[PDB]
């Protein structure tokens, strides 16, 4: 359905949250990959608000402790995914209308994401 637009909007929202946590805690944030459907689109139109597909929070050593990804514009079963490397931890957020961004049934708030990122930093970050 039309959930896609607000999904990419909340995707931009989550990216904003990651950037803010990075600037606050003084920890490296990285834009990992852009959309192939925007790179290789030659004349083809691009309606997505941003062209960024993958981002990460890396420690002082550059090894990530938090990874976040969004499904491409043309893939089936669209979702947003989170992963803690080395921690065998994976999260799958969808968007429910009216409620907002939810991991399954549990609302995914900015505070929730901040707490998860702080724990990930303290545990996994090598430096």
């Amino acid at each position: 359905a039309s959930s896609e637009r607000e999904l990419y909007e909340a995707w931009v929202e989550l990216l904003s949250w990651m950037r803010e946590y990075a600037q606050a805690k003084g920890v490296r944030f990285e834009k990992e990959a852009d959309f192939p459907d925007f790179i290789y689109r030659m004349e083809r139109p691009y309606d997505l608000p941003t062209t960024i597909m993958t981002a990460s929070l890396s420690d002082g050593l550059g090894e990530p402790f938090l990874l976040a990804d969004v499904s491409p514009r043309h893939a089936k079963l669209k979702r947003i995914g989170l992963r803690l490397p080395r921690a065998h931890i994976h999260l799958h957020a969808h968007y429910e209308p009216g409620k907002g961004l939810v991991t399954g049934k549990i609302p995914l708030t900015k505070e929730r994401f901040f707490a998860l990122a702080d724990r990930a930093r303290e545990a996994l970050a090598f430096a």
């Binding site: 803690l84 998860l116 724990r119 990930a120 545990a123």
Partner: protein
């Protein structure tokens, strides 16, 4: 960490050939896990130094299994079996209710600080499905809604599981359903 207990190191390495010390990575990892709640890079480097191999090797080993946690976990890390039998016993709705009530993802922990959640595969007790494990302990079997909530309130009030009153009966090797 293992500075304290060198007798335990001797005991575990004596179980393995002198050239097979790297076997001891498993018991060392397991002791660190059960004692501190999660495995730190310092623990992995120490296991490596004691056991005679690289921290990269030890990390590869440790990150291979599901039991080994590399992030802090609550005092009670509820490992919910979700496999076919347990689902046919309602593991789906059980996990949905637990996760939605506690408000936690598999990676994080309740703000109370004692409740973490995690899914797990077959715990090898299917006739008593659904099944749940608490961090080292024999499974809390025959998980009905009442048994779950009672275990929850008991742990919430600090009652040790081994002495908690659990409604309903759980068969040993067979169990009568009525």
């Amino acid at each position: 960490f293992f500075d304290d207990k060198q007798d335990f190191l001797e005991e575990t390495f004596a179980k393995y050939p002198p050239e097979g010390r790297r076997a001891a990575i498993m018991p060392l990892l397991r002791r660190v896990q059960q004692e501190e709640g999660w495995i730190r890079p310092e623990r992995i480097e120490e296991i490596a130094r004691l056991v005679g191999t690289t921290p990269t090797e030890v990390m590869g080993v440790a990150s291979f299994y599901s039991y080994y946690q590399f992030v802090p976990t609550g005092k009670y890390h509820l490992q919910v079996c979700a496999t076919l039998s347990c689902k046919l016993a309602g593991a789906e709705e059980l996990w949905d209710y637990l996760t939605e009530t506690l408000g936690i993802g598999p990676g994080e922990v309740t703000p109370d600080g004692l409740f973490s959640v995690q899914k797990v595969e077959c715990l090898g007790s299917c006739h008593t499905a659904p099944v749940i494990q608490v961090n080292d302990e024999p499974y809390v079997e025959c998980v009905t809604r009442a048994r779950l909530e009672a275990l929850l309130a008991g742990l919430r009030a600090g009652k040790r599981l081994e002495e908690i009153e659990l409604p309903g009966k759980c068969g040993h090797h067979v169990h009568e359903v009525e």
